[PDB]
């Protein structure tokens, strides 16, 4: 959960990397 | 993960639509 | 999701709970 | 754009707010 | 804005498309 | 809007770097 929303926070998909499970 | 993001881009919660799991 | 949703809402990491699962 | 990258990071759009301009 | 962030997730950069104003 | 996305793809305001226009 936490990293995930570090990952939507750089843009989710458009970060180029896939989706944390956390 | 991606798609649960294109759902909160949707409005989430207030989308009308459940959110999904990937 | 939905709760997790809401989690972000109230800004993530920045609200002190663990992140929902739903 | 940091106001705006902050809102992305609530869900952007499932947020419950309008996207800041910065 | 809300646009936007229906791009991101999308793909952004990698969605095959031009990014939107709002 | 491009480079705003791979600026948030790069850690957003945590990077330290200021917001792109594009
Ligand atoms: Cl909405
Ligand atoms: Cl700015």
Do not use: E, I, K, N
């Not at 995930?4 to 896939?18: H, T």
Request: proline share 18%; hydrophobic share 25%; no cysteine.
């Amino acid at each position: 959960g936490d990293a995930y929303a570090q990952w939507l926070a750089d843009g989710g998909p458009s970060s180029g990397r896939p989706p944390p499970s956390g």
